[PDB]
Symmetry: D3
Subunit: 267 residues, 6 copies
């Protein structure tokens, strides 16, 4: 299977790319006027060790900027520029009008650097968890960057981690506020079940042990301890793995370091 | 003066907040249905040492979610939760229907954590540069997160750094590609000047010394060395300060750590 | 709990109402010019027996048209105008400028008539299923009207039915095409599980009996026969109920009759 | 002439199709990831007797999903699957990547089923009216589904009915509220004429006989009785035809039954 | 009656104002930051003789910029600053935060200057036509400024002229291309009538005399000579009036001079 | 260099063209239905002496309407139809389906007529200024038509004039309100400099001579008298040129006469 197939042939995500382009040119592209439209060649370079992520998003930028691109690696490939003399690896060869290439360049690179960063941090944390013999899952959170949720979640997947719930519409998550708002975990779960129906799971944050058998009895699908039915642990921290099914961390995606990429025209 | 005044009373930025809200609820807010609309009180907590940033953006989220908020600190204030017994500081008191508060909570916090992160990294790097007796400026770059440029640039300012050029429409930046595309730095500068006019500056990346007096002679406003007229150094690295006017770094805003915030209802 | 709380205080749905208004006035509201802005009173009338649905959507139309409204019944209330002398029941009292009322009138009524229609058909089919002693659920489908999915699903809920999966992003549904595309139901389920993760259910359409224990063994959450784990029957038809957990029908929402409403100014 | 030519080569309607696609995939298309991009063949099937309608709209869905389609019948053709052994007729042959076909499938079918339903109900009511020797017109109304007005009106036309006024901007419609708001039918008509000008007709709902010669004298183009100049009757009901020019009914388009279509990949 | 009532309480036109605001501030309002939010008073001044037009549009700008305004004249009032000592007339008094006032100022004035210009040119040409004893109408055209059609048409009305058809959806206009495309004026009219129905007029451009009785016989509502049924003359020119019903000119709205307005804060 | 290269390959401007198309067809294109899709040939004619401007914008209309076009002149070429027998010059040859051509025709021409008008007025005023031996620049203003700023500024450039600042985000402009708001020109400039940074110029409107050396001392880049550092004169008027660097006038773009264009199908 191919991760990029998760993105619909057309939909809001492609309009996002258009809006990212507009964010960079609200009036006129002066540099484009001076550089002209002569066809040029260019190489996209990965300048740091990490996993390549964000290909279809970057590809869409190149498409809208009407360029021709040849990716040298599959998305998800782990790149190691430091095995290099030069300190970099060309992951793509681009051709098109000079102005178009230079227009696409910053936006496309901002996508790759951040997407790869998330994937790399994601893969690092799961391979690490995997090394201890842990068989459960490491999941992300909803603490994503405003407007970039689709991209960051996608990166989590590429990095080999679980995405966790996409949004507030996705898998219901009940807490203290929800439980005493209805009267009991049983009431919270029932009301939640009354509207989400059978198609979506309900997760309840439980602090006690009798706060959790009731939820399980109410029909909850996932139980969270917070520092048939699955068990989740919310905190992360590191170095702790027991037999919980899910360990969640915003560490695989938030406040994450980027992987440096670059682009240079040939001649 | 007040930084938030940089944001127009109304414009695209407020629609961005609406879209961030939609990103979290594409269908239905199940948790909101279960929690109900009873008025509740809540405190926004800063859980890490850093500079508070993103207030008006978070405030707009609260406004659209129809809540009442009292900020306890001015934007830009340096918060130090570790001076605490508890390990946190309440920077805001919120009141409104339970569902509305819980709807606003993740998006608002995603704004604050990232905005403060950028401001904190920005302030740290400039105060550091300032400590050596450096009188120039530390500037950001265009390597911002797709769709979040307005917020990140704003954060740079709050953190005390220069924003540098906002976009490709803003101050022209000529490089090798532009110079030989026209024939000479003089030609590149002239063509650029022919379209940007007097109202906008032109910056030319110069590698040589005769690559820079010509630019200065062509009328360039800023000259970059890249690793009447100002001088800029592109690389960063640290620990190097001479007499350049501008030192640019994506370090104050890209791949930056976030400042952890939280929100909890009272009762 | 209150169904309208499923709708976020703000989000795309309110912009939909604005767009519905624009759909009716692409240039000028000539009738509004002639009627003027004198404050008027008006009654919204239900002219057919059925369940009231679409209140918050209609309310939003009234809000944007700057009117004051008093609903006489709770959403979901079963109205019976034929118990009437007059043949109608006033479900709301509206006040505001004459032009504004007449602007809101068609769009608001188009919402109510269709929403109530779906709710009424939904409630009729589930109360009917309930009468035979059936304890399972009657669910809707994705055969909703383009652009009106949020409203129709909401109506399904009000009518007392299960919504089923909201969209292609919601609970995964594997079929023949997906199973041999991967090689086996086990492969289909695994790949699907590899990307949706733990937070979302996977449903597999099974035709055979060995086509279903494998799916159950693969970890599928729901199994469909199509004419721990739940069982669903896709066809509907009527008059057949056994012990399946879910019976799905587009009958509760597609090609559904509307409930006639009206609006008349007093004086 | 060809009905589809009524749709502009480009405009808002194509963006509507994009938004319908987004309505189905707010995050990720899990089924698409599992099915892959192998080219597949597929047949669109009409499973009920009725008139084919909505071709260009469905075609646009297929275009955006990057598929190749061959329609086997002209829009408007009356299909009769029950003349079948199989009970269905293939109205189109589709080819493209498996994921793309399955992405397009529900949205495209939701268009066809509803559009054909309206066309079929429209054609049935007009052919029926035509059979009595009636030479006037059967028109629709503004009681269309929010957001789907363009599609439903188009379907009315295909079905052979008059669309009636498209919106509040289109042909002015004065009633009691408008007449006493200005003082007299003559005043209502004059004010309306003062703003709509010569290019658009004015229709006045008249209850009396002296309520109608005045309107005709004021210059009204159409007169409605409501249960040089044309005459319209608003009610419908059936089985009544006299010599009015227009008989309007929401029956040809609202609360209308759908025509069932399907789509299945070959192999 | 009041012209501003032609604008729906809410719809696309208000979003246009928001977009005009964004067009002026794509990033940050530096001047707003420096001026601050102290409440200020200000007068809108009309600096040239002409008819005041565009009030509700300008008012919407002021509303979105959260200001308080008192208009001193009714829209349509003919202002004569040259009767002045000072050379200007205050048509409005504005109060609000300094930054907000200065934000609204250019956009609002760009609306007023152009709207009044169109109204003034419109009123001048019709009062002129009226002075010769002409009883027909002077109409505008579709040669409006891209994106500003609603505003310019509205201005035409205020100026006392007929708007003519709003768009291609409004009143059908057949020409040579349409007539021989179908075979005959009769065929062109019939096909056009087959889709626009009874609710909309059909106008046919006729060059001959037998090119016009046929159209009249086909049922055409308006006949154009181009340099029951109305007669129109397309050219304008001036100084020619006979007994045609409509004389059209882009002169009342295109390439029209603006009426100069200004805004100054007090203190 | 080529002016059209100032426009990004993709961005908001192309969506503007789509919206201009929608502005003309909110429902159905009746004329298109009657004319059909037969391929036709057509010539775009310039009917008045002036400079051709707006090519890429018009070209985009033609692209979206799926037509094939051959421009006979380069943008900026000065056309002189009055050197003609016929009184017109064909500047483009268009081919495509009849309906598509007729759909594109009004919008495309509305672009050309206005864009060329601005360019022609711009070129006339600068060539005039140039004839007196003036070596400075003639600049535009922000008094542009709402929504059409990109097009009008572009036209200014083509006409050979300076655009001046694009928007409120572009080059800061301080006035009296800003100077006493901060305390002194020095304070106004400093605060402005504190937020715009080094990349953008600051212009201060000075009335006195000591109101201008301070600004120059504060670091202001441009000084305006209003009726290292440049000098600007705001008024225009004509027939006055001294040694100022910039003379600004809304005359080159606002209330400007249009250049008449036309389009006719062959056969």
């Amino acid at each position: 299977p191919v991760y990029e197939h998760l993105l619909p042939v057309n939909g809001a995500w492609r309009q996002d790319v258009t809006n990212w382009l507009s964010e960079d040119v609200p009036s006129f592209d002066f540099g484009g006027y001076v550089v002209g439209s002569d066809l040029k060649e260019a190489n996209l370079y990965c300048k740091q060790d990490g996993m390549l992520c964000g290909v279809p998003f970057a590809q869409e930028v190149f498409n809208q900027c009407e360029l021709q691109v040849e990716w040298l690696f599959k998305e998800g490939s782990f790149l190691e520029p430091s095995k290099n003399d030069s300190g970099k690896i060309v992951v793509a060869k681009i051709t098109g009008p000079a102005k178009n290439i230079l227009l696409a360049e910053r936006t496309a690179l901002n996508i790759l650097s951040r997407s790869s960063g998330i994937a790399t941090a994601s893969h690092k944390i799961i391979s690490l968890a995997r090394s201890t013999g842990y068989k459960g899952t490491i999941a992300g959170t909803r603490k994503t960057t405003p407007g970039l949720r689709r991209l960051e979640k996608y990166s989590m997947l590429v990095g080999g981690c679980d995405t966790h719930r996409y949004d507030l519409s996705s898998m219901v998550m009940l807490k203290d506020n929800h439980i005493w708002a209805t009267g009991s975990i049983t009431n919270a779960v029932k009301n939640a079940r009354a509207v989400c129906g059978f198609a979506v799971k309900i997760e309840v944050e439980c602090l006690s042990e009798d706060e959790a058998t009731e939820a399980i009895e109410a029909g909850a699908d996932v139980i969270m301890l917070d520092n048939h039915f699955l068990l989740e642990c919310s905190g992360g921290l590191n170095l702790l793995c027991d037999d919980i099914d899910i360990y969640s961390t915003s560490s695989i995606h938030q406040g994450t370091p980027v992987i440096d990429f670059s682009l240079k025209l040939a001649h």
